């Protein structure tokens, strides 16, 4: 059949505004048919590290209830996004479990944040590492001293959120990168989203 029911899977990749890295954006896509091959075919995708399956087998296999996690990171932090690795962002902002059969895309957005951008916040201080797929949203004055922390901020009383120095005259490591992570569960019971078929 024609089966022309393309879903917003092809729209989130072209969204002008994303969310913060600690308040990473989550999208659930299902009940649609879209081609996954057109993504890596384009030459505008700088980084494509896809662990769950080979890039050419996305269309061959059918999945369920696909989940997309989107955020923005710095230029020299792309290696932090990997299952079972170290990193300040990988520990206090977003962590991948080792048993993660997912797929990762990342691309530059330097021209979209030129002057630069000073509305980005990221966690820097936390008691322990984050749990997998944890939407930890909260605000508190981080304390690192024996004396109790109360009232106004000061010594051993810090704000765990800081901005980004995304100046328009910076090279690699200071250019914003849009990062999206695709995950899915295989055939829990029904099947809604599969690869396209040609006739």
């Amino acid at each position, epitope marked *: 059949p024609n089966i022309t029911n393309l879903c917003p899977f092809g729209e989130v990749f072209n969204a002008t505004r994303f969310a913060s890295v600690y308040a990473w954006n989550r999208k659930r896509i299902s009940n649609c048919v879209a081609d996954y091959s057109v993504l890596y075919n384009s030459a505008s995708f700088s980084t494509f590290k896809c662990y769950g399956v080979s890039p050419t087998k996305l269309n061959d296999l059918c999945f369920t209830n696909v989940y997309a996690d989107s955020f923005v990171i710095r230029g020299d932090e792309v290696r932090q996004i990997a299952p079972g690795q170290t990193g300040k962002i990988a520990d206090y902002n977003y962590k991948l479990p080792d048993d993660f059969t997912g797929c990762v895309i990342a691309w530059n957005s330097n021209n979209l944040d030129s002057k630069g951008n000073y509305n980005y916040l990221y966690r820097l201080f936390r008691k322990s590492n984050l749990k997998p797929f944890e939407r930890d949203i909260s605000t508190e004055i981080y304390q*690192a*001293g*024996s*004396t*109790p922390c109360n009232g106004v901020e*000061g*010594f*051993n009383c*810090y704000f765990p959120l800081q901005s980004y120095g995304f100046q328009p005259t910076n090279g690699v490591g200071y250019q914003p990168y849009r990062v999206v992570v695709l995950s899915f569960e295989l055939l829990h019971a029904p099947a809604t989203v599969c690869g396209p078929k040609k006739s």
Partner: antibody
Amino acid sequence: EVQLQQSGPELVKPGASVKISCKTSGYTFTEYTIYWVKQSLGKSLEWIGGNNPNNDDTTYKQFFKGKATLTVDKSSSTAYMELRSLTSEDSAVYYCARDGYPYYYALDFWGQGTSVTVSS
Amino acid sequence: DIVMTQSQKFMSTSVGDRVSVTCKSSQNVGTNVAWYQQKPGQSPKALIYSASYRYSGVPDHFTGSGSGTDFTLTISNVQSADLAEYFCQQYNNYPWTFGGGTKLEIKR
């Protein structure tokens, strides 16, 4: 596995500048702050101040002006005190301590101290 | 404001009698203290933590007190290695300031 080796006694001159070193080794230096106190030959203990290895923050007491300066270095993994205006009564012993945030608050570990004596 | 006197500067116990020292503080600022032993010549050794807790590295047979704006500590007895100075702690505001100390004398 916590240890602290300091310098020996020093003789200073009034109206001069001297240095004291607190060396920390055998454990990570980044997390816990370092505190400085003094003992003036068995008198009451005074909290000279404290410093943060990571944020490079420095905090003093209400009345400390005269030698208000701290520094730390990670290459040598130590801290340096600079004493100025050794007028008439600063002859005492300096103690360098480290606290613990996960457990054992309030200066668990101490040092041998450095005795500085003022003379002409 | 900031004052610590613990109602005494030195106390004397001859033989057998239990030793106890208070750590009366200023007006209500918080509840967090400590007690350190000061042997005559070397670095201070911590005696009690928050006035009621235990140390792994000390043969702890100690009695503490409750909470509030007043503090008290009780030590086991007068052994042969108890003659030292007693220091109390108060860590609420950044300008840390301790008391005048307490001296234990074995009244021969």
